[PDB]
Design an enzyme around this catalytic site. Structure first.
Site, short mmCIF file in Angstrom:
data_model
loop_
_atom_site.label_atom_id
_atom_site.label_comp_id
_atom_site.label_asym_id
_atom_site.label_seq_id
_atom_site.Cartn_x
_atom_site.Cartn_y
_atom_site.Cartn_z
CG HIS A 1 -0.34 0.18 2.53
ND1 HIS A 1 -0.13 -0.88 3.39
CD2 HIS A 1 0.09 1.29 3.18
CE1 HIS A 1 0.42 -0.44 4.51
NE2 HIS A 1 0.56 0.87 4.41
CB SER B 1 3.32 2.21 5.85
OG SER B 1 2.06 2.30 6.50
CG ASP C 1 0.69 -4.30 2.87
OD1 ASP C 1 1.14 -3.77 1.84
OD2 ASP C 1 -0.10 -3.71 3.64
CL LIG Z 1 2.06 1.19 11.82
#
Ligand SMILES: [Cl-]
Ligand SMILES: NC(=[NH2+])NCCC[C@H](N)C(=O)O
Ligand SMILES: N[C@@H](CC(=O)O)C(=O)O
Ligand SMILES: [Cl-]
Ligand code: NA
EC number: 3.4.14.-
Lengths: 685, 694
Positions: A68, A617, A200
């Site tokens: 993502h 992320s 991911d």
């Molecule tokens: Cl996080």
């Protein structure tokens, strides 16, 4: 109160931090993690597009981040001819790697305290206008290489200033991505959820010129050669294994007073939560009927329900943990410590001032994000009409330049149902009239009409006719823009917020910020040796912890690791979220796991006690020897409160097992050449 | 293919069973559990109204069971001014205890094999069904003949599908009064959301007292009856339960079918369950609506809703677990080894063909069985007006068969029994559920046996117009007079007329064939059972449950429902608090309990500042085991059984030990509720509280 968790500046690890880490099992030194002198871990951990983290995993500039994180680049390179989102993407050769406009990757050369130079403020309220002065001053002044850039960041609410010496690489090319079914397996349903089974990840390569320096895209730029890259462990993880996470956490607020937290739990969060919940329940109503709309609004239902979930998580977490009350016990102790330190003249009234300004800013704050959550972001026409509103008072060149870019909203009218929109405008504008603080309400008071009437006259429902409204000279197009009933209703509420709310929200906001910086200063002074760490501010930080399960509810325990078995348990043929590609199901049924397997089973994800937040992320998780073991991509639901209150019993970060990554790259993609480019090691014996 | 779990006849525990129990930590012996020489555990565990289990916990007849076992009794004395369903109920002294008509409690005196006497002459001298016909005469023959005391009763039960017959000498007490019950919010905390679900935080219990005449013998109700003095009562432990603790559950499990063929499982999963699930769901949705909007309607429907809802959800779980575990394939694999063992034994003539015959008949019966399910569910059970109409239908053929005097006897008995039917009957409710269920029967039932349905009934809402089945005063008038006339009065009623079209359509065009095939399947099942008993002699084979006294044992043990998820074996009151939703239909909490939690006023029932509430173990149970005692290694009461976990709702058909668990109320929570919450300490003074872990 002894602070739990921690997001630490990588250069200040000696002392407390390193002692904790080595007692948690770490084998490497602070020096291996950061150094100006020699290659350290920080050289393998660049900032990804200013909002995420990535890490170098080969000496030829191969970098790893989340699926993502690379989603936008992947989606930008995909169409119905080359649908990379669905099929994945793999560059067999380096020349097959796809360039990305507006993608930069930033490396930290050096971390430098410049608090003294920035702070010539006090002894003078009108000159943090001076530190803006001094920042610009010191930025150009500090020792920098020609191909490097200087960044000054505000730490601890303005009690510390640190200059980063960085290199901004502007040529970052897509190397590999799994299919979305893998990279976002369980999409919305498993967002913020553990147990998690999502691969991911995505891969890019950093490119540079012939001098291994940052450069714009050239067709003969070369792969960047890193100062350090992370070897990938094949041995896996176990419970109580030491883990370290390095990344760029965006924002925390761990030193808020009780009054601030009360405003979150009792006013602001419930406000926004109901708004997005309205937009969501009504969106899911039509998505439960037509499947062409379901594919349409899936990415957008996602984008909105994401924060809907986070805020519910935060409220429940804060309520469940009694954060407000813990904050109050602290403030009773704080006051005592001030009194015993003889510092009442500096800090004595901090808490009493907080309460009055926070009590007062409440109607503005709630009215403010009702405007935001209804006009600016969730009602897609009001958001369209709002985008039109902000180009209005750019005041001609600046207007037209902005308008050539605003005409390029092709992809949103594409897959936009104004039938659907009419639903959200009805429910959301209703809420604003019957729930928002009535003293700051504008063109409400009763107009249950102008609902399909606005979607029936606005030149903002289709794109071609949207172009037809923005047609015309520098002028008259404005005359044409105010002619529209849609824009006239966006203007209306926007004018109101900009004169009746913003002028005094911003004022109290500065009073509160000023208080907070004194509060933070007071805490640092009065509570040394209590593990106070600077709030996140999109700078490189280190956190650490261990592989550990947790309990979310009475008699329920979650183990700290998942397996492919668990994904097959969630497998639903043809489902938009839980479908599994054929080769992966084939690979499962034959246990074809290669060197990535573990006793006939394949690890997928694991969770840790590391303190992360948005911005983390794609962050690397390394073992005690500094080898990549995991890839960070989420936080568990029960600890989404972790920005306001960290609870070591239930706060967990979620990581992809690197064995799973390489498995997908290898046995699924057949891209073994990416792996030969890596260093595969065995730290356990 | 060694059979896991088990429900054992308590007189047969010596040998394999006892070794297994002692190995788990049992300290007492088989003779402590069952004996005819002296008192034993069985004397403290009576059958509660023939559908649940209860246990004696005092020497003055105090018995303990589940709240949902006492539920029908509680609902029966509840009203708007005295809502015991909501408020609970507590007899502060023995004379306040509430008499219950038609509530019996049965003690087991002795367990006696009578196979030889029952199968006497059925060898092959007949015709399978007139074989069953002769069986019924031997049963009646032994029941009358077997030696018992005057106050006792004999009951012959069938085991192993007909391979064995056992007679139970029993004492049936008939004066059982309500002593205590918690509010429903504690009694069924979580209602249907938490039904069949672990973790569970439900105080599922109620208390009754057995009464007897001056000879300590069964007696119909009388103000002069006195508390029954039992042969044995269970002391109650205060030392709680820890993981791996031996547990033994004794009770009266109703039904189990562990030994079905592949084709039986497929019929359950593929067609019987989905039909009945869809039918009950529509009925319950209608009923739920009216009950959340009116307490008076909730008092009317409480018991009737809970019964229906319980199996509706059970069947969802059962179909879920059977698919997920692939029981159908699991049995297919066993069956391919079964016949490989009938050839090895040289018995292809008795067996072998069995599996082929099953597939034949199970396929053939399919559309009748389904159509039958639709008839029973829609006419007999869920639509209350059709239900009453169908009883008139049956009473019609009593006249035809058994005569005019038999008609008027059972008619007058039907009228006096429809009393509480109309107390709980709501015309408005039953018609909305009627409108929804008749729709399902027409549209989703097998069309080749549909009745008058002609193809669209449209809406006939007011058949509740002036059917005289809607009202009790009405209903009496319809049945007022001599045997005929009444029978033609009934034939004219628009309600009974409609049921008639569905009934004789069933009884003539579905029922004959279904019966024929089912008799063949049953007979075949009898032989299939015997076959498995022969070719697998030391494989822990236990008889299917058949509502007789059984023992099962195991240990306090959690489980894992899914990857990375573990469920611990015990719950606490703070877990109930986590589920608390103020003023909610299901998860509201009483005010007094919240206070007790906030004060942590647990007294001798607490454990380091926490209040245990429920726990789970590897005991094999089924419906009927509701209210069964769980006892520890020394025979002390430590838990009260009341459910199974979601993953093991399949366990009547397939038992998997890694995920089948029973759910028990912790006795510490029971006593806490009796004591701290209700203030009924006097009932506790009656018990023997013990400390076995000290
Ligand atoms: Cl996080
Ligand atoms: N419908 C209910 N909630 N009944 C109470 C629980 C009954 C339990 N599941 C057995 O059967
Ligand atoms: N609640 C059921 C017991 C069970 O299904 O386990 C009765 O008896
Ligand atoms: Cl393997
Ligand atoms: Na753990």
């Amino acid at each position: 109160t002894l602070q739990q968790g921690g997001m630490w500046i990588p250069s200040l690890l000696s002392g407390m931090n390193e002692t904790e880490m080595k007692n948690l099992g770490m084998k490497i030194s602070a020096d291996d993690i950061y150094s100006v002198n020699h290659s350290s871990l920080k050289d393998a951990v660049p900032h990804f597009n200013g909002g995420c983290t990535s890490e170098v995993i080969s000496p030829k500039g191969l970098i790893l981040t989340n699926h993502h994180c690379g989603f936008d680049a992947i989606q930008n390179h995909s169409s119905v001819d080359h649908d990379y989102l669905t099929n994945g993407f793999w560059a067999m050769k380096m020349e097959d790697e796809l360039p990305n406009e507006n993608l930069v990757v930033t490396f930290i050369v050096s971390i430098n305290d410049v608090t003294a130079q920035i702070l010539d403020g006090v002894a003078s309220t009108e000159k943090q206008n001076k530190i803006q002065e001094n920042i610009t001053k010191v930025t150009a002044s500090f020792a920098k290489e020609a191909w490097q850039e200087n960044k000054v960041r505000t730490f601890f609410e303005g009690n510390q200033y640190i200059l980063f010496v960085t290199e901004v690489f502007k040529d970052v090319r897509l190397v590999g991505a799994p299919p979305s079914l893998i990279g976002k397996f369980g999409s919305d349903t498993d967002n913020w959820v553990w147990p998690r089974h999502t691969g991911d990840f995505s891969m890019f390569r950093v490119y540079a010129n012939k001098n291994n320096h940052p450069a714009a895209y050239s067709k003969d730029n070369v792969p960047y050669i890193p100062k350090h890259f992370l070897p990938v462990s094949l041995d896996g993880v176990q419970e109580d294994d030491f883990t370290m996470v390095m990344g760029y956490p965006g924002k925390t607020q761990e030193y808020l007073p009780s009054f601030a937290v009360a405003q979150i739990v009792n006013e602001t969060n419930p406000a926004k939560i109901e708004i997005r919940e309205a937009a969501l329940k009504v969106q899911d109503g039509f998505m439960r009927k037509d499947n062409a709309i379901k594919i349409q609004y899936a990415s957008k239902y996602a984008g909105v329900a994401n924060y809907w979930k986070k805020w519910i998580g935060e409220s429940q977490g804060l309520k469940k943990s009694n954060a407000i009350g813990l904050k109050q016990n602290f403030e009773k102790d704080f006051q005592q410590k001030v009194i015993a330190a003889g510092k009442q003249n500096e800090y004595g009234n901090l808490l009493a001032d907080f309460q009055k300004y926070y009590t007062e800013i409440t109607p503005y704050a709630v009215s403010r994000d009702y405007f935001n959550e209804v006009v600016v972001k969730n009602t897609e026409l009001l958001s369209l009409g709002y985008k039109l509103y902000q180009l209005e008072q750019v005041f001609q060149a600046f207007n037209d330049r902005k308008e050539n870019l605003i005409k390029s909203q092709a992809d949103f009218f594409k897959d936009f149902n104004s039938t659907v929109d009419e639903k959200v405008f009805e429910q959301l504008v209703a809420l604003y009239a019957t729930k928002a603080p009535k003293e700051f309400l504008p063109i409400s008071l009763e107009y249950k009409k102008f609902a399909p009437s606005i979607y029936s006259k606005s030149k903002l429902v289709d794109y071609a006719n949207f172009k037809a409204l923005l047609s015309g000279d520098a002028k008259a197009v404005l005359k044409k823009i105010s002619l529209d009933k849609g824009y006239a209703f966006v203007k209306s509420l926007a004018d109101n917020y900009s004169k009746n709310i913003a002028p005094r929200y911003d004022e109290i906001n500065l009073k509160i910020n000023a208080l907070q910086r004194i509060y933070m200063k007071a805490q640092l002074e009065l509570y040394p040796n209590s593990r106070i760490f600077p709030d996140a501010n999109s700078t490189l930080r280190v956190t650490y912890g261990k592989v550990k399960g947790y309990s979310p509810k009475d008699a329920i325990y979650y183990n700290p690791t998942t397996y492919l078995d668990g994904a097959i348990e969630k497998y639903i043929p043809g489902d938009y979220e839980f479908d599994v590609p054929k080769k992966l199901i084939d690979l499962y049924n034959n246990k074809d796991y290669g060197q990535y397997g573990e006793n006939g089973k394949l690890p997928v994800c694991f969770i840790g006690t590391n303190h992360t937040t948005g911005g983390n992320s794609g962050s690397p998780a390394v073992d005690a020897q500094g080898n990549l073991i995991g890839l960070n991509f989420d936080r568990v639901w029960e600890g989404t409160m972790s920005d306001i209150h960290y609870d070591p019993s239930i706060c967990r970060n979620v990581m992809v097992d690197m064995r799973y990554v390489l498995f997908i790259v290898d046995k699924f993609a057949g891209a073994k050449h990416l792996i030969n480019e890596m260093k595969l090691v065995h730290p356990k014996k």
